[PDB]
């Protein structure tokens, strides 16, 4: 069963208006422009018993992710594969599956990690991939964090050696298998503008968002819209462009916070 | 080396046409009737080729439990479901992860249409079950609901219409088979109020360019249309069939 | 924990009374005599992906039952034996598990389908006969309709080739191990009239009801007194007797269904 | 492999003619922080059953305007069979709690406390059949050691068909290895039928002399009922109907 | 989630003061003195079908503890060890939780009962025992009457011949491993007093309890602060010294119901 | 095969003495969203404890009508440990959450907020030990950063007993190869004991020095919490006691 969230903190048409406002001269509250992202941190190893870890502060939002690698027997129904597990909790569920298997479809359709080269003895073994991602504060624009966090975490991983049946986790083999990080942009429709990155207040006034992951050459790894509210063809058409060039700028910083 | 020719198979073959006769502009037949339950306030069962779901509406009424009600609005009670027998390998019936975010997306796909400030205090339940599927299915769920919704007369901004418009081999088709689904580049469900251009459901799984992107986009609208006009339709007469045929 | 159902509809005496005036004169409200069953609906394989099925209308009732088989290793306890498994499920729990036990019960202890006969390789390897029963829509006298949904699904049930190991779907080598059709006849105690096949009001204002289930040769199968009322010693006398010449219409009614 | 159910001096596995019960042990009021208790012993099945006595319901809009509402529970412990049994509910126990639950309603009488709720729990320590009426016996007993005002006491017996021959009170052997197993339970004063199963099979005129079968039984069983009411304690040897 | 109980029988100030009035003259009102045990029945055998059980009363509360034995791999992090799985039940969840982990931290920690010895096969089978433990009747003081009814049941418990892969359960081989009894003691402070066994006036209206458990040797074996308030230092000395020579009361009328 | 924890030195795994705490890190107001926060680190244990403030309680039948209802949370996230510990609650879990809640009740004034919720989430981001106190701690320190009313701060530490010795707040090594695992809390200014458990075997003699041993742990941490309150960080390398 899924059912409209009761505890919904309605914002006043009064404030709402007064967002708009500002908008309309092309200027948010925090002083950003509407195709601005939030400041941006990345803390690689913050969580020092994890195979790889990443904190993420994309303005007020804080998510922690990490890996942990372990040698299971492949599912009959993937024999040349690895696996990969992200799994998301919020702290202050279903938005939580949500954001798990988005940021999954984006890391696993892109190719950004390959299951595999993560067979050991084919048939046999392979690694496992634990991705859990903590939302820690929750400052709007989740998501976007959340994958920030997950990619940030995978290149963080180290990959220990394999004694052949046993792992050894004081001799550091390798990383993980990765092609290229993966970035994904929501753009949020408030009246008739379309905003990147919205901030709590943004998201509680919006009608929808829209979240777009792409890979370094711009390719389009997944799409997810989100809200109770709807967006015309031309918006998205719109969004997407946006998202794309906003994009860029993400995946070069990331790129400085993870050292390329 | 040399032989091993690849493993996934071709999905855009002779002529122009895939693995089931289809152009790449094709709808699958359609198929939809209304009022088929006599205990639900409202009610539809909507087949796109192999797809079928049925939607049950237990229209407005005061909720169970007050606090988890609205003071301004109806709450939306949404459950996607497949059977065991709808698939090949038999479902587990426990939600799975899928399940659970299907029924959110489809929820809020719903309250964009529903009217729902006209019942304060009070829920309104949409229970989906998918009977058979073969790709779309979340689609043909939501539009199911739509048109029980409908049924109940439970007014709404417009009625709900989608298709999943994707990529095969470097081609953009159509409404997708379960095959195409399965070893297709992209998936991309669409959904819309037509007359409103509103996009009230909109995922992408796979891969594609901004350009192939704006030309599926397109190809789903003129499906959308095509599916919309079924839906007007079944609304006055209670059951259309239409059998397949290009945008 | 069982509890009191809180949901309960509560019924007015003035409409309860109306009822009863008309059983008075031996006859419903739909124009039935207190003996009549709905009229009966049988659509087989409905559900195209399911190995059989079959959708009933009872009156306003609707159940669509589907099975579903599968190669397990048996029980270590029974080992000569394949699997039954029924699940229902309520659309519109307990009851639900009330209703798929009394038909699982119904149907294994009358031995109406063979389990002996779905053993393949001894102690290896049988089937499993998943029947999933769903009640889409709630028009009273569910387990009646239940039974008939499940019997049919059974019957229309295809076997496939067993490649010895793997399972072959296109190559449908027979048809379940069935010895005969069970029907499942509830009778409901109303004021001091007894009705067969109790609508949705007459399911609401009864005081109980009981249910017999019958194989062809009439020989009592299960019996299942269902309500939060009681019933005296020649209700129940009375009701079999009732249920029993009841049944042998139902069964011939089935049997046409089924061609037999 | 099964048992011979009968030999032929007509007597069954544990040494009882067809028309025998097996003894029979009642107390109340043995739980102290309960509003009312009740041990029950049907040969070896033992059941307890506690009653929290009415009392308004903990979320209001799950209570009943004009009624109470029955909290019924029925449960194994895990070590009252042979095998280990786990402690989460089966779904067996979840149905027997609902026929126990009905059972009761049809006795008590909850119009008189709108807006409560009455709990009623059972545990079983020793299972060697007919427990689901041991189980109903001592709740109902129960009750009336709470005071709760009841149409009348209930008293059950599983009757059933062994090697063809009509048998009362049911051993764990009889039970799995038998034709039919018919649990039925009573207000005898009223003549009123609150539970009735059968698993099994039988034909009607096997069914209606089990049914004679259990009445006797009932009305054996009910007697005992009454007298524990009185003096808190009865014990009762075997012997026929 | 772990919240502040909102069932609570907030007992009032009046009848506190009463007791504690009483306290002062170093007597409670069942008339026993404030370092007294509350009268304590042990009935062993009590659950037939169990391989050994206990009923106890201490005061008003009753506990009923059974065990179970069956035969298990042994856990990979585990090779030379048997299983102790203890569980407990209220009644009249999180509270049952504690109680099982304080029961079993104090059997385990302390070797009272011998993991080792119940190793059959080394690697390949182990004797698993469940021990199940039912509250009965709340009268306050739970934990100690469990530990009395686990270890009661523990000593209770017949193990049988193991047919080598089955067992054989008429033919009684012997008993659990078991080095010594083991007794936990309940102080409870209320206002400036200490309180042994505390009954269930008592703990509503205690400020905190404090549980020792010891060995014969009078070894503590584990400790558990329980309830709302606080408890100074040196209420905790006093606590265990008072624990202690009740320990010793305590271990001789246990093993008086034990035989020794 | 089986490590010593005290080499011919007198020093532990680490290279800490008997009387010396690890290093402690303490930073408050470190979630803009929560109503108070906090992250405490001992040595290699990370906690952080988020605190939404007094608010009205969502089910009002939940609620008390003089106090506060505290909800608290311990959670270990699944990267804290070796190997990955299950996101699911285990009965460890759901112990510490109440264990730490009752601590919690001993120091909020919550008469003051009638019909309100506090919560209290705490996360575990490294376990090396003493977690359910770093945890506690955490929590205190989050409430204080949100303003809660409260008698005292808490301060706690595991003392136990490593080869025949009394040793001072403990690693992973020494919990599981030690005799001995007291994990203690206090309000240190009024003396008054918040937490406490022992598991591990002591005779009295041992359980008294090492309750001596933990006060003095325990009034360094204390320092330091009531330093951390006004400047918001606090460092502390590792010392003697
Ligand atoms: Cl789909
Ligand atoms: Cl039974
Ligand atoms: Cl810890």
């Known amino acids: 069963m899924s059912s409209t969230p009761s505890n919904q903190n309605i914002i006043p048409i009064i404030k709402k208006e007064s967002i708009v406002s500002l908008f309309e001269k092309g200027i948010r509250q925090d002083g950003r422009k509407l195709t601005d992202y939030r400041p941006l941190s990345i803390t690689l190893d913050y969580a020092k018993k994890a195979d790889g870890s990443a904190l993420v502060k994309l303005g007020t939002t804080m998510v922690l992710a990490g890996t942990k690698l372990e040698i299971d027997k492949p599912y009959e129904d993937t024999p040349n594969q690895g696996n990969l597990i992200v799994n998301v909790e919020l702290l202050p569920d279903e938005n939580a599956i949500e954001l798990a298997r988005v940021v999954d479809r984006s890391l696993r359709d892109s190719k950004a990690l390959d299951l595999t080269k993560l067979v050991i003895e084919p048939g046999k073994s392979v690694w496992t991939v634990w991705l859990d991602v903590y939302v820690l504060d929750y400052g709007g624009n989740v998501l976007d964090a959340c994958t920030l966090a997950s990619v940030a975490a995978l290149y963080n991983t180290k990959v220990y050696k394999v004694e052949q049946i046993s792992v050894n986790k004081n001799e550091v083999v390798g990383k993980l298998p990765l092609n290229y990080p993966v970035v994904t942009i929501s753009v949020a429709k408030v009246d008739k503008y379309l905003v990147v990155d919205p901030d709590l207040d943004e998201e509680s006034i919006m009608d929808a968002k829209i979240s777009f992951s792409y890979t370094p050459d711009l390719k389009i790894v997944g799409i997810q819209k989100s809200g109770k509210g709807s967006m015309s063809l031309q918006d998205i058409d719109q969004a997407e462009n946006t998202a794309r060039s906003t994009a860029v700028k993400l995946l070069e910083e990331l790129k400085k916070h993870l050292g390329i | ?247």
């Open chain 2, 1 to 247: 080396r040399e032989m091993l020719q690849v493993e996934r198979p071709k999905l855009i073959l002779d002529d122009g046409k895939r693995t089931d006769g289809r152009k790449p502009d094709e709808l699958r037949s359609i198929k939809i009737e209304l009022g088929v339950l006599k205990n639900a306030d409202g009610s539809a069962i909507f087949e796109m080729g192999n797809t079928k779901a049925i939607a049950a509406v237990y229209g407005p009424k005061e909720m169970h439990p007050r606090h988890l009600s609205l003071p301004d609005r109806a709450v939306l009670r949404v459950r996607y479901h497949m059977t065991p027998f709808s698939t090949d390998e038999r479902k587990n019936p426990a939600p799975s992860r899928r399940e659970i975010e299907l029924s959110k997306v489809i929820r809020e796909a719903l309250e964009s249409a529903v009217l729902v400030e006209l019942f304060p205090r009070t829920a309104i339940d949409v229970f989906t079950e998918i009977l058979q599927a073969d790709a779309g299915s979340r689609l043909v769920s939501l539009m199911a609901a739509s048109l029980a919704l409908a049924d109940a007369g439970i007014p709404m901004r417009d009625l709900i219409a989608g298709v999943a418009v994707g990529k095969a081999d470097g081609v953009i088709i159509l409404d997708l088979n379960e095959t195409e689904d399965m070893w297709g580049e992209a998936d991309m469900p669409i959904a819309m109020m037509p007359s409103l251009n509103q996009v009230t459901l909109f995922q992408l799984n796979g891969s594609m360019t901004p350009d192939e992107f704006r030309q599926a986009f397109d190809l789903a609208v003129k499906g959308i249309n095509i599916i919309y006009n079924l839906e007007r339709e079944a609304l006055k007469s209670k059951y259309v069939e239409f059998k397949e045929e290009g945008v």
